[PDB]
């Protein structure tokens, strides 16, 4: 997890001349210690866009939108741990995840090289949508587990019978 120092000198007063010559009181007032969560969100967004993207000026690009939604998703996840019952924020986070996944699918379809780098840098694992979305009930789960175990036992027994036959024929061909 990123650790922005409390004296980060937020971007609204970071790119101005003569900021390091000011006294500690003004530096602390203009730093992140006296700032709210929005300033830290801006700092994280710029830090991520400077290191993951190649053209920070192009905000309309899919890779820019994905990294813009990434910080919002992380902020929503941070809020969720403190607020378990916040259904509105849970819905916001779940829909932001879906939007990010749709944009990732579009980026994978359009430019694969950028998609791979974005996924590798952001740690996002893109999974293909599973066909036939179904609610796995108890009967189906039990029957599927039974079928898998039966198939494994049948193949194990057939492999053992094959080994026994191979040993018998090897013993018989010698004498």
């Amino acid at each position: 997890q990123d650790d922005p120092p409390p004296s980060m000198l937020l971007l609204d007063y970071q790119n101005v001349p003569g900021i390091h010559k000011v006294d500690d009181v003004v530096k602390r007032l203009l730093s992140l210690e006296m700032a709210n969560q929005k300033e830290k969100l801006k700092i994280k967004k710029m830090q991520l866009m400077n290191k993951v993207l190649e053209n920070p000026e192009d905000t309309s690009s899919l890779e820019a939108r994905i990294v813009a939604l990434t910080v919002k998703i992380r902020n929503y996840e941070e809020h969720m741990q403190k607020h378990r019952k916040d259904k509105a924020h849970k819905r916001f986070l779940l829909m932001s995840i879906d939007q990010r996944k749709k944009m990732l699918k579009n980026l994978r379809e359009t430019n694969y090289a950028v998609f791979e780098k974005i996924c590798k840098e952001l740690g996002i694992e893109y999974t293909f949508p599973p066909p036939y979305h179904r609610k796995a009930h108890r009967r189906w789960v039990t029957k599927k587990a039974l079928c898998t175990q039966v198939f494994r036992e049948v193949q194990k027994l057939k492999k053992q019978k094959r080994a026994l036959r191979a040993a018998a024929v090897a013993a018989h061909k010698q004498g």
């Binding site: 039990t142 039974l146 039966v150 198939f151």
Partner: protein
């Protein structure tokens, strides 16, 4: 107007609720009996899979837990 159909549906629902209240325990007995047959049918369907797969006995470590006779 539409109040006639609304009242007809209201009367039907009220009569159904009264019938359910009067025959509650018979309905519970019927539901339990049908769940018993449902569980038995599921057990036999699971048994038939390994019967037709060639296995003479159910796979080791298999219990076939009850899924319809669970308590409230």
């Amino acid at each position: 107007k539409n109040i006639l159909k609304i009242r007809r549906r209201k009367m039907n629902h009220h009569k159904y609720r009264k019938l359910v209240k009067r025959t509650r325990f018979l309905r519970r007995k019927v539901r339990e009996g049908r769940l018993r047959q449902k569980q038995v049918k599921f057990e036999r369907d699971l048994k038939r899979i390994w019967q037709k797969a060639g296995l003479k006995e159910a796979p080791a470590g298999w219990q076939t837990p009850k899924i319809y006779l669970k308590n409230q």
